[PDB]
Amino acid sequence: HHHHHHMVHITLDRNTANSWLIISKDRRQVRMGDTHQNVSDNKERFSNYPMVLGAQRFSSGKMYWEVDVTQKEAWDLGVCRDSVQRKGQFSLSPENGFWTIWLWQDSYEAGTSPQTTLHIQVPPCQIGIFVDYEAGVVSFYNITDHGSLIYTFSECVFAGPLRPFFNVGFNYSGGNAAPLKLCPL
Numbered sequence: 705h706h707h708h709h710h711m712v713h714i715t716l717d718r719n720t721a722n723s724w725l726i727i728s729k730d731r732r733q734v735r736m737g738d739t740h741q742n743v744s745d746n747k748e749r750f751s752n753y754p755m756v757l758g759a760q761r762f763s764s765g766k767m768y769w770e771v772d773v774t775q776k777e778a779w780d781l782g783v784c785r786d787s788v789q790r791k792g793q794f795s796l797s798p799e800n801g802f803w804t805i806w807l808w809q810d811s812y813e814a815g816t817s818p819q820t821t822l823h824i825q826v827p828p829c830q831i832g833i834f835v836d837y838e839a840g841v842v843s844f845y846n847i848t849d850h851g852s853l854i855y856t857f858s859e860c861v862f863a864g865p866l867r868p869f870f871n872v873g874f875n876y877s878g879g880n881a882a883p884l885k886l887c888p889l
């Protein structure tokens with residue numbers, strides 16, 4: 705792809721984080737802590753899952769960023785509406801305001817309803833995410849495999865400002881402690 709020149713500097717919004725997450729000083733990395741991280745509750749925090757938003761909001765244009773997923777067993781990545789539900793249980797779907805892919809139990813899937821199987825021959829260590837607001841497109845690229853396409857959501861109905869979306873996943877296995885990292889431009 706030739707989307708690299710729309711690169712944007714994403715940082716994580718601490719106030720949206722689940723209370724067990726640890727965000728680095730530079731706001732470019734996030735991992736699951738082994739306990740509550742001693743923050744106050746607020747209406748922005750994702751309560752049920754290890755999720756956090758980017759601080760940036762997008763309502764126009766083309767945007768691109770990259771995320772490092774090295775050595776993780778489970779994660780979700782993409783974009784979501786600013787107005788997505790934060791509390792309680794929900795599914796990741798465009799009807800609920802999410803345009804995402806994930807890794808879970810050694811398979812990759814797109815967050816459609818129901819979920820869609822992805823076909824990835826080279827397990828990615830870094831994911832590229834491209835949003836074209838006007839076109840209604842969210843695309844995912846395998847940086848480890850020469851930028852090969854993973855998935856495209858089209859005819860998207862964003863219906864509001866978009867935020868970068870992250871889920872570091874639970875660590876029940878002891879094998880999913882590694883962080884998500886926003887990669888340098």
Ligand SMILES: O=C(CN1CCCC1=O)Nc1nccs1
Nearest residue numbers: 761762763764786787864865866
């Ligand atoms: O999105 C905005 C402002 N907007 C709209 C168009 C571009 C821009 O910068 N403000 C919000 N405040 C709280 C929720 S969204």
Ligand SMILES: O=C(CN1CCCC1=O)Nc1nccs1
Nearest residue numbers: 798799816856857858859860861
């Ligand atoms: O779901 C959509 C479009 N829609 C319908 C409801 C909200 C929204 O964004 N596009 C897809 N592209 C690939 C698989 S689903």
